[model samples]
Target: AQNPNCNIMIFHPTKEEFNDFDKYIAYMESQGAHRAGLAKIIPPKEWKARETYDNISEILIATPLQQVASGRAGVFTQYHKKKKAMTVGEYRHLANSKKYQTPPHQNFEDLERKYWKNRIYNSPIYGADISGSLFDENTKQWNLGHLGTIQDLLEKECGVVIEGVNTPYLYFGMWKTTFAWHTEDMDLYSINYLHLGEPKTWYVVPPEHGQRLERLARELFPGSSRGCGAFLRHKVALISPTVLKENGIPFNRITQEAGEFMVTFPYGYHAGFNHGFNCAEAINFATPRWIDYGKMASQCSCGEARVTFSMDAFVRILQPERYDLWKRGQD
Candidate 1:
């Protein structure tokens, strides 16, 4: 019996409205959608693109579900053994997708309790880089993939491919499964598409309010805040909007359905849980403004691992051809 009030911006753009996607995004940001930190964009009906399930079920990999309390801000740990991850079709059935689409999807508190009472442990697929291999044979062209992110300079100019960053990452979500509050690497503009399934509810706190949550989180888990590594970015903790409101924090809720997309502003903190079984793909993109945001943090850190994308190299490639004479001097 919980309600987030489910308040956020929703855009139902006509095909022409979305023709120049990047232009529309810039216009939206200027209108101050960034303050809410998230927006749900129901793409034009013409966007009939979807990932090939046959390819995903066979080639995709799965990570054991990291369990969390229904609404409590439980901190979960992540560990993956050094081996080829267990694939779905290789191990188990992709299952009757329509079954998880109804009944048991909503009411996370009750559904999660049923999960444990019935002794259920599920594996949700994460980090599925489908950039090169996965394709839609129906169309046979990846033309619609650009909707996930704007022009990616990292791969085009810097010649680097970072999974889930420049490369699109597919996510498989089940009932009671969730992702924690985390900003994207380099605080880039992160986007997600709900390819199909029930709505995935999102909780968002604007870039300005991001610090307030961190301050409160630090108090909630003193040891975590004391560390130098990424805290929320670790995708470890899940907190409800009820608690967030109690702490005087501002946030918004969004239930993103299939054929819709969600875009998180640079450095905006957002998280969510699926209503039921669904498939989604996400990617990160950068704009000229992100140069300053990228400078706000250190390199991308994943616990003991560090991403090798050098901003310095990216800047060099992004610069105007030849040279810059304006080093700025006065006599």
Candidate 2:
């Protein structure tokens, strides 16, 4: 699988310009950014994001490694399962091993590395709980803060917290560490910022190509969608956009560098890999228009469990007062 090389419109916004997310997104949509499924934002100079995680450590997740030579996709099993209660870190000692080449890529080609059994997977850390938004963990306030555009409708109106989805969760990736193709939870929009280290390459399929990409993926990885129509939501399949282009699936790509924020529109499919050991923070947001897509997604998302909040309840709360309240706050 080779890289997906496509470019998206990039914006460098000053603090004033960065404050209004919707205004910029409206302009971005007019520029045909939505057609590519993504846009990039480079923050004003000297902007810095603060965090509550001073010394973060937690049980790490075990991912199924893809076999380059095999015909089958090797990821889905890790879903509804993880190896055990392992942990994260060890750049200094592990890098000394020099087992990885300069790209420090986790080609997963080494297959059975004796020492890797200890796990650098604990190498990265994050929180996927959707119970709390970026507002606070017990009201302490943290994550991609005002570094991203501050006017997210989901947060300002809902007052709901969806840890990784509505708030920021951090990720540490080494070269070639891949995030398989998928869309945001509940078909909402997402934004990720590369805080430090190497560039990350992103490949995206526009919302309009949503079904074609799924149809092709189902054909390619047949059984994945057999019992589980939403297998991609498991984040278990990896496909190169080069193949997508070859198959004539409309898509685009971008090399997101440090200090850049990347946005994924509702229902857009995207996947990417890290260029090196880097930390990125991301969150999901939704506009009122997302109500219909989110509702429709709720109906079709069978087979997934203990995932997502109720759209019925969420939609129920939306009345004109909330809209009036938000606009008043915006002013």
Candidate 3:
């Protein structure tokens, strides 16, 4: 309650014109990204939406198949019974097809928007091979906070590779396409970069107050997953910021725009919805500070718990790399 920059922080690039990849890495290493449990970064230039879709369309087509569900009613409809999971390609076809139409009584535009938005919620796209696609890098530059660095370290040290989970996960959303309240897998920090799309509204709570919010959520929704964060497994329940504030919990709101990056630190509780149709990509990384938190988060499961990143392997193999960062801070 006493902290001014308690919940969320917004950061702008150092200059009016700067490179996105270069500046993003710098921001992650700075106080803005590290201190605040969540950080929203506004880029120098707005991303052209057409180009973004063009570049990733082929990749989305070739990506491994996954199931998605969509409905005219909200995501919580019929206890998620109305939801039907289908292939990514199929979902896109239905969304783009003119054959599908709303019922006769409702406004076409409104229902169309709702359909498109809900379609994205059902089919969140992912797996863009960003290796040499977006930014060109000769070797060292690629290692500068890029996905490959973390991927390589995990594979080499732990002899483990997690498909889809380890790589950058892409998301395409429309109005009301939401992610339910939960922390990142294993409490590792996540950076969500809105490549090109409409803004996304985020409701964030700091790591310190995570337990309190969980307790409140359990009391409110008794049937939600037990012995885990109360919001994790439940159908998308949009908790109002006003409600949280009235309960004496600090909550911050931010509508992240295209070319903006939102960083969620370990144990930071966050959830939100997209205002309109949009696309985004996110990846997770770990620092020394995440070790203890990662261990605790690994045990927390909505259902059938899975560890995104192994803390045991990190401690055994990559301890020195993260430890050095902490050591330098002390120096």
Candidate 4:
């Protein structure tokens, strides 16, 4: 089948903006965000691969209990209290809690906690793409955080910011694998920047795309020649565009390297893997906090009482404009 190649969008900073890395790092630190240890030591103008790592970035928004000013059960506390389907409100509250206010390195233990301490190791580097919000089922309160916190962190660290067609939205990271592909969690507009590395990217079409390919084969490559039709209805050959190929017959299979590209995910079963020698690739993403599924997913069970709500009739509270935007998008 033939299909349109996933559009690749790119962005570059002015030469004058070269020195802005320090300012960006400051911005990331000011918001109490964490980073991969490599981010702190890597020179902004240099590119060096010290090790093969799955590290990315980790985020904590605010925990439901802490956000509501109830400090009784924090992330670790709630994890032991209740374990259930992950909720965004709960996750956001935990992310913003004082518990995570400091480097996770200072407090956490175990593989999950240790990795959580490293910003880059937060994602499930080997599984599906998960995205959703933590909601307080009781009060219906939603967990929220400082807007563009993740994006700012990426730009500050890598010196590259991906602006969308109209708005400013950085491209997330890329996942490459030699194993058979499967499903993903979120279907948001995701762009992968293969910075300093060559990875084989296989862009497979969705299942519905298979239907088209099957129809193409049947309509064009008809009945047997032994005793069948004199002519094959290969009209499909002429009618179908080369760009409409299906999964096994994907339209794109190549090793992408250095710079940025737009990837509209959940478009199909797409995957990739590192090619040639390994090289360091900086990842950029927004709504990053949504990817965590470790212990935090279990800790959030206190319900909506922990979330922000209007407690008094005399006072009024207004939500920030950025919060509205964040609520609209998954983080």
Identify the candidate with maximal TM-score. 1
- Tens digits of per-residue lDDT for model 4 on 1-331? 1222332212233334334543443443333222110111212233222222234234221221111111111110111112233333343233344533223233212322332233222211211122221212231111111123443433454464533221221112222112122212222222333333333343343433433443443444354222222111111011111223322443333334553332323223343333222222222233333233110111111121121121110011112332333233312
Indicate which candidate wins on lDDT.
1
How much lDDT does each candidate structure score? 0.58, 0.55, 0.53, 0.27
Against the true structure, candidate 4 has what lDDT? 0.27
- State the weakest 10-residue window (summed lDDT) of model 3: 73-82
Cα lDDT, model 2, residue 86:
29
Sorted by TM-score (best first), the order is 1, 2, 3, 4
TM-score, candidate number 4: 0.26
* TM-scores for every predicted model: 0.71, 0.67, 0.62, 0.26
User: Which ten-residue region of model 4 has the weakest summed lDDT?
Assistant: 69-78
lDDT by residue (tens digit), candidate 2, 155-192: 55557542222345656555545566888766777888
Compose the digit string of candidate 3's lDDT tens values, residues 142-210. Answer: 222355444444565457663333556566554445565777755778878776656677877878778
Residue pairs in clash, model 2: 6-253, 88-122, 120-123, 130-162, 130-163, 132-161, 133-161
Model 2 TM-score relative to the real fold: 0.67
Which model is ahead, 2 or 4, in terms of lDDT?
2
Global Cα RMSD, each model: 8.3, 9.4, 9.0, 20.7
Q: State the local distance difference test value for candidate 1.
A: 0.58
- Candidate 1 backbone clash number: 0
Off by over 4 Å in 4: 1-179, 197-199, 206-250, 279-331
